Amino acid sequence: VTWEEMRDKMRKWREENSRNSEQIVEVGEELINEYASKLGDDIWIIYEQVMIAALDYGRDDLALFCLQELRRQFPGSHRVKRLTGMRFEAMERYDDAIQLYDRILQEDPTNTAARKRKIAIRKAQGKNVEAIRELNEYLEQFVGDQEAWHELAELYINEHDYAKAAFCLEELMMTNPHNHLYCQQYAEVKYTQGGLENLELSRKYFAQALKLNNRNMRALFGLYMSASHIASNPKASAKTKKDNMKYASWAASQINRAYQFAGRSKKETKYSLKAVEDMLE
């Protein structure tokens, strides 16, 4: 392949927050040497993307190589200092990292990457009780960070504090109302949280996610399992009961059609025989 395609691949793997570190470093190591002259100021973002990926890949033989060529071109830059701190943290040196980040925060008090790497250690050290608090403080300082608002939801779900994770997923759904994934993950949180007072929201959101993305199947399964769970509830009225038994049947009339088209796509395997026997129950 040509370098004009490798650059597009390294740009696509950077627009979406992919973490395929092996496939990223396999293409980065070439662009560092085989096509360094074909691209100009595009080599620095590639250096940053390759260093952090090689760190995940556990290959420091390229991490420091891409770090020194960034420390040379950008002497004293705050992004390269953050890269050095992340390398320290990857090499189990959690002691120098806090000092480096406190030194960074005293030059530019508006810096946020240092604030996030200060809680990255707490997540790595296991002090999630402290990590969640230090992240909530940062959120109280810098509202609107749609990355920390999702990391907080993840930390709360792992902490089994499903109640407060909904408060973060709502802050995420208000800013990205066109994103079906934020609806699906909120529906799942409401499903796992409680009963009729929350299944009533989970059923609505598993359907809103379908309306925003008709190709979503997780939302379809969630809608089916939330409609059945309200249909099989003792506190459910007859009206809600029959409406839920209608919703479940309407969802099952499409689950099999999706699976029917899937089994039609594979002339050898037939998947329709797998889910239908489950839908009749």
Binding site: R19, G126, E154, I157, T192, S202, R218, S226, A262, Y271
Partner: protein, 182 residues
């Protein structure tokens, strides 16, 4: 109490496909207990009920026709040092205990490297600190590396990747098909 080379190879392959994220699945067997294979379910954020309770039925519908029965459940924590079972592991093991006796709670210790907790009337206590039984260790260690060096985990597919596209087979035919000839 013993795992088949297919179960172990699928486990390590799914664990290697998503190193930064957690790994979970269901070890299914034929109906003293031998773990023939596992169905890998999800990765990343596992503390979610609906997608986990869908996999139960969507795997039962395959095992009842394929004369199989779900026997155990394995989990691989995100961190490299912490291998203690979370509340999710217990809450899933208790669910399979009501449908199949002798449930094994497996913890993939990233740094052998596998713990097996069994429930005897009080809690879930491991056996790896004392000893862990397998059919044959060198055969498994060889066949696992034989698929690891070829980067076959990029070809492996789990239930999470199947929920994204139905063209993917959660039973991993192209994996055990290569395992048989190795």
């Amino acid at each position: 109490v013993k795992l088949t080379t297919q179960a172990y190879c699928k486990m390590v392959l799914h664990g290697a496909k998503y190193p930064h994220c957690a790994v979970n699945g269901l070890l299914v067997a034929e109906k003293h207990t031998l773990f023939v294979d596992c169905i890998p379910l999800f990765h990343g954020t596992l503390a979610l009920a609906p997608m986990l309770e869908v996999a139960l039925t969507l795997i039962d519908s395959w095992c009842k026709d394929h004369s199989y029965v779900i026997a155990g459940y394995y989990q691989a924590n995100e961190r490299v040092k912490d291998a203690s079972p979370n509340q999710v592991a217990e809450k899933v093991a208790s669910r399979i205990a009501e449908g199949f006796s002798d449930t094994a709670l497996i913890m993939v210790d990233n740094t052998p490297t596998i713990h097996v907790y069994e429930h005897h009337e009080n809690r879930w206590r491991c056996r790896d600190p004392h000893h862990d039984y397998c059919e044959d260790w060198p055969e498994a260690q060889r066949i696992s590396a034989s698929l690891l060096d070829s980067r076959s985990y990029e070809t492996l597919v789990d239930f999470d990747n199947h929920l994204d596209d139905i063209r993917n087979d959660w039973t991993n035919p192209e994996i055990n098909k290569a395992v048989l000839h190795l």
